[PDB]
Design a protein around this ligand. Sequence first.
Ligand SMILES: O=C1c2ccccc2C(=O)c2c1cc(S(=O)(=O)Nc1ccc(C(F)(F)F)cc1)c(O)c2O
Ligand SMILES: [Cl-]
Lengths: 233, 234
Amino acid sequence: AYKLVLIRHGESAWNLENRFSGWYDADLSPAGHEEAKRGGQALRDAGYEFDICFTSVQKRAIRTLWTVLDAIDQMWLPVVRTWRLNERHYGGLTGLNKAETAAKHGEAQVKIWRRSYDVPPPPMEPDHPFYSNISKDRRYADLTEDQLPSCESLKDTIARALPFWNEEIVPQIKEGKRVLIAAHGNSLRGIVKHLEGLSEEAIMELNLPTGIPIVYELDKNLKPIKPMQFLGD
Amino acid sequence: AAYKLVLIRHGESAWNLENRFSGWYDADLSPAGHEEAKRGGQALRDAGYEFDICFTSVQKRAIRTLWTVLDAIDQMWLPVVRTWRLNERHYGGLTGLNKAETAAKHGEAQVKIWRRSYDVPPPPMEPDHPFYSNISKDRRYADLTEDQLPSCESLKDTIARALPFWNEEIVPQIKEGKRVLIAAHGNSLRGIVKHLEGLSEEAIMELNLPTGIPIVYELDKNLKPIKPMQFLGD
Ligand SMILES: O=C1c2ccccc2C(=O)c2c1cc(S(=O)(=O)Nc1ccc(C(F)(F)F)cc1)c(O)c2O
Ligand SMILES: [Cl-]
């Protein structure tokens, strides 16, 4: 059976993972970096070998990948980065903590957003402190108008992640390349939902742990032959 | 000029401190070499440099140099391409030996012949060499054909396998308008510099590229330098 490993990055600076970090390019905190080290060491202890790596264009994921590759002595592997594996774009909520979000929008609406599969947050407007920082970042300069989000529902996030999965990652897996993916909660949710055929409600209830290698064994049709497995202790 | 190319040679490795021939052995940076890379990266950051694509070898002292620079200039998101063709020169049977061991075994005379030669290789790395399986059987070279995987290299050999990557993969990116950064090794970079400047064999053998410092070329549309290489920093 094919083997696929996913890893979700850990903690980012300034408590940004509890502040809808989204497309803001927050770095790992020292603790998130250590999480990645422990994941890498788990993969090393278990003797894992990869042939190709995929990650987003966000430095907290990239640095997670770097840390893992360092730990397993496979810094020489080919690495492919794509905005399509980015975290969900949280629009105008980006950077806000829970209290600020509730104060600005009300508990009713926040409940609706938190439980909805295809309702996006409000768009990130020009007066948002991250607006030019993100929308005019030259790493997205080749994106067309529809491609560069101002906000995303979970449905949107999964919709732009899965074409990369199908077009770039799947052919590698079917060639027998051992794939490592270092990415984010919601883009990885897209992949997991596709792999396991999960419902919208199920994927919204699924919370992937951070810094832990997530192992899939896939058959010839890229269907898991058993539940996802975690490496470490 | 039309194009800008930046080269960087990695700094001190753990085996440099041991005075040992590394070649294709995958020695890591020393702390000092890592700091060198940080200073180079900061020089590129201070000068506002932007890149569109990066090339490096499959050796971690170069790769980690690249990572350090990308971190410093906040461009960790750039596409990166790794290739064995940018590896350090393969030092064959000398690999793993220090200065003393090499002179003791071969004589400073024979070492004279090797280091002053453009096209005399060191002896081959044989199956009984202590690093033979560590290097020759490393799965990162699994796709090399039999003729491609060196047992040893003269500088001529090194340049001969580096320049095809330059011509076939890097040049087209430059003419596409991509701003290229190459993080690699003394001898593979020598290959590139020799091609760019049309240098003689003796000239390239007398050229010693400084480490950890961004090397800037301004190139015309035919990739001819319009002025000498420049070093970035203070
Ligand atoms: O209010 C929202 C929300 C609002 C608008 C668009 C999208 C969402 C949204 O997607 C969301 C929300 C709240 C929770 S929650 O409380 O149940 N866990 C959570 C997750 C992340 C954050 C963070 F602020 F750090 F991003 C906060 C809370 C979610 O899980 C969640 O996905
Ligand atoms: Cl990389």
